[PDB]
Design a protein around this ligand. Sequence first.
Ligand code: HEM
Ligand SMILES: N=C(Nc1ccc(CCNCc2cccc(NC(=N)c3ccoc3)c2)cc1)c1ccoc1
Ligand SMILES: C[C@H](O)[C@H](O)[C@H]1CNc2nc(N)[nH]c(=O)c2N1
Ligand SMILES: OC[C@@H](O)[C@H](O)[C@@H](O)CO
Ligand SMILES: [Zn+2]
Length: 409
Amino acid sequence: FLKVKNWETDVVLTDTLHLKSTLETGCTEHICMGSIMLPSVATKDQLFPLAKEFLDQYYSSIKRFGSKAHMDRLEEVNKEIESTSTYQLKDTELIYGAKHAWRNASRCVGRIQWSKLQVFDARDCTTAHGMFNYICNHVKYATNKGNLRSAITIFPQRTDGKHDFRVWNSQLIRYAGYKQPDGSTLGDPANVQFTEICIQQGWKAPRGRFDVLPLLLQANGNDPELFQIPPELVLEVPIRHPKFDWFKDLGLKWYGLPAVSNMLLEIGGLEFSACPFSGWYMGTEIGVRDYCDNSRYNILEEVAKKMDLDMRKTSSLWKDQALVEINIAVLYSFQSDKVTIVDHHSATESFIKHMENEYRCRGGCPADWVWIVPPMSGSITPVFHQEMLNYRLTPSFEYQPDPWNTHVW
Ligand code: HEM
Ligand SMILES: N=C(Nc1ccc(CCNCc2cccc(NC(=N)c3ccoc3)c2)cc1)c1ccoc1
Ligand SMILES: C[C@H](O)[C@H](O)[C@H]1CNc2nc(N)[nH]c(=O)c2N1
Ligand SMILES: OC[C@@H](O)[C@H](O)[C@@H](O)CO
Ligand SMILES: [Zn+2]
């Protein structure tokens, strides 16, 4: 029965949800691994407790725990796991599982929206083209002409493991990254390997900074296939500043729709290796990390230059000064174009309120401070002063290796 405190408001919450936790954290009694980035085929013995646990909280959530349809469903799944050494979720159990995987995502600050999630059952898909068709429909729906809506598209579950549905892209919409003969990098340096994996598979690269990558779609373990998202479905914001007319000359833009496609969804012991999910951006992922990480677009050099800043000393804070202007520009551009976006002040305040609800109606809220606190202006947002317990609940989104490190080609 643990206690978390907010040191800006003295609000105290009591966490009992963590008792339901199950998986490992990495930490021990004598070492904390809270800042480690990455934290690290089935059998049927393993599968039933995972189905039981899941199906018990599912009927419990609709106020029908332990009774008739519950006992039937437990027996039903028990029998199918005997017969098949796997089983299939109902439409309603898939929707509950997906929403709760997001609800348990301790690194996600946007979880006040967890129940407002559109689930697309793509479990009847069989080919890369079908995957292409489902993904285009996801993009179109979730983008909603800028009025973004959250959605997940769920492809068939892992069975043996040699037949695995995978989206090889990191995000459905990501900009390309090309190295140059002179060592430097054009575009997004994060994606340079994947960009070349597509060029390998015959992609024809326009070789600019902001080239929307093609999709590489792997279906039932077969080789992955290239598909170009129709450009009309890829909504993009050109980045301008509401003071600096020279900011347009920077020629920056970003896509409106963040849609993660390399994660693994775990529902009731079942594994969905292809499950692209989308919401909207917090401003700082673009303005701070994408634009200003040294390993990414790294534009602080070229913005402070145009801001006429003393760049010879670190202590002039020219970096910080240009970081803020870059983020005023992302927000202003997105809002002027009516493309849903949230600022780190609005999102972290909403997450405090979300935490309030989760301790009220659930007994806790797993939360990773290292990831929840925004990468700029940490302590002027309310989550900096919020103590948070981190623990792993299920259903969950897990990391998974990149398919080209593992696919017997
Ligand atoms: C609705 C608007 C949403 C906002 C504003 C939001 C915001 C964020 C941000 C800023 C991060 C940190 C990302 C990073 O620094 O790499 C994050 C992480 C995450 N989000 Fe949310 N998100 C939203 C929707 C969703 C949805 C719809 C899902 C799943 C259905 C989701 C699942 C996750 C997961 C699993 C992580 C952790 C990823 C990792 O550990 O690498 N989020 N979110
Ligand atoms: N793997 C490396 N780093 C690395 C880098 C990043 C990550 C995780 C990044 N998740 C992207 C992500 C995940 C979840 C949400 C968002 N955003 C959203 N708003 C959003 C997207 C969908 O709904 C809301 C964005 C994990 C590892 C690496 C290896 C070598 O060098 C670097
Ligand atoms: C080393 C550290 O764990 C790593 O840099 C983390 C820090 N916090 C983060 N927080 C978010 N939201 N996203 C990130 O990628 C990271 N990176
Ligand atoms: O939206 C996520 C952003 O693309 C970055 O945070 C990357 O994780 C690497 O900088
Ligand atoms: Zn720890």
